[PDB]
Design a protein around this ligand. Structure first.
Ligand code: ADP
Ligand code: MG
Ligand code: MG
Ligand code: MG
Length: 312
């Protein structure tokens, strides 16, 4: 026992891996090195284009990284579509994902699906969204398709939620931000603490005070409706990704923290918005969280001398 693991940091802008590098030395079993020192057990790397090529080569050196190469395939708005449209065991069972299309600055099935709604009298309000980049919430197809060419960024038109479930007082809108960790073995872990971001119609609601509104103002509960469904979309998007990201054969390990973003309507339904690959958190959590990313994700590979997570 009593080993001394190494590690480097190639992303300092990251507040989440800034807090871990702190808890890391917080056990004196670790030691940071130079940004370009190959001799590492762990690498807290950059948000974009991480050099997964120089990993696994050092002999007798096992390396864990905080990103799963290719999980951008779930974090790219665009790619998020291609992925669900492709996936057979999903495209059918997919009722929680706004019909979206990627217009090449497709666009065909767009209008074709736009008319069918204009000709059946019903909501026909969409929203234009950028890949990694501006947005627009229109109803005139052409007033959009002719607006994604002025951007030249390849966007995605998505069904806008006309009937959102609001909050009282203030009668404001909101979205929930989950937090999922996936270690080297591939065990999903949902951090019990989520967070609501709201506006005027903003604050920051927490699962405790939020579950309040869902009963003493409403007729239901936080897990008897929402959590049940969230714990599914998540489980499904990841299980559909497992094949293209499994490091089961590469010469190194990797884990990652994802940030799911959902929306609920008056019908009480839950929809998925986006998934974040390098999501940050809330200042009242950076502590209880970052400790998990080391308890569950890190020390699971590199041992040490010696209720917050759900495994889907
Ligand atoms: N499909 C949608 N329907 C209704 N509202 C949406 C939809 N997608 C996103 N939103 C709203 O947009 C907000 C998020 O904007 P955001 O994604 O943070 O812009 P950006 O991606 O540039 O940071 C959320 O609060 C949510 O209410
Ligand atoms: Mg990887
Ligand atoms: Mg990560
Ligand atoms: Mg192991």
């Amino acid at each position: 026992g009593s080993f001394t693991y190494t590690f480097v940091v190639r992303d300092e802008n990251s507040t989440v891996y800034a807090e871990v590098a702190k808890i890391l030395l917080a056990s004196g079993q670790w030691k940071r090195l130079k940004r370009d020192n190959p001799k590492f057990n762990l690498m807290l790397g950059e948000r974009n284009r991480l050099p997964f090529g120089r990993l696994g080569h050092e002999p007798g050196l096992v390396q864990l990284v905080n990103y799963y190469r290719g999980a951008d395939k779930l974090c790219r708005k665009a790619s998020l579509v291609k992925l669900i449209k492709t996936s057979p065991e999903l495209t059918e069972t997919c009722t929680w994902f706004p019909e979206s299309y990627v217009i090449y600055p497709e666009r065909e099935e767009f209008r074709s699906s736009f008319n069918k709604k204009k000709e059946n009298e019903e909501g026909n309000v969409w929203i234009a969204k950028s890949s990694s980049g501006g947005i627009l919430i229109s109803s005139d197809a052409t007033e959009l398709l002719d607006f994604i060419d002025n951007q030249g960024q390849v966007h995605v038109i998505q069904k806008y939620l006309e009937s959102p479930l609001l909050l009282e007082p203030g009668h404001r809108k909101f979205d929930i931000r989950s937090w999922v960790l996936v270690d080297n073995q591939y065990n999903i872990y949902l951090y019990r603490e989520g967070v609501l971001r709201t506006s005027s119609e903003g604050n920051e609601m927490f699962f405790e005070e939020f579950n309040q509104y869902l009963v003493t103002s409403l007729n239901i509960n936080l897990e008897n409706s929402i959590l049940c469904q969230i714990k599914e979309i998540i489980r499904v998007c990841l299980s559909c990704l497992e094949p293209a990201i499994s490091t089961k054969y590469l010469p190194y390990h990797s884990f990652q923290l994802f940030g799911f973003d959902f929306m609920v309507d008056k019908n009480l339904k839950v929809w998925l918005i986006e998934v974040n690959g390098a999501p940050a958190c809330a200042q009242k959590l950076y502590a209880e969280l970052c400790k998990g990313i080391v308890d569950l994700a890190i020390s699971s590979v590199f041992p040490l001398n010696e209720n917050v997570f759900i495994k889907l």
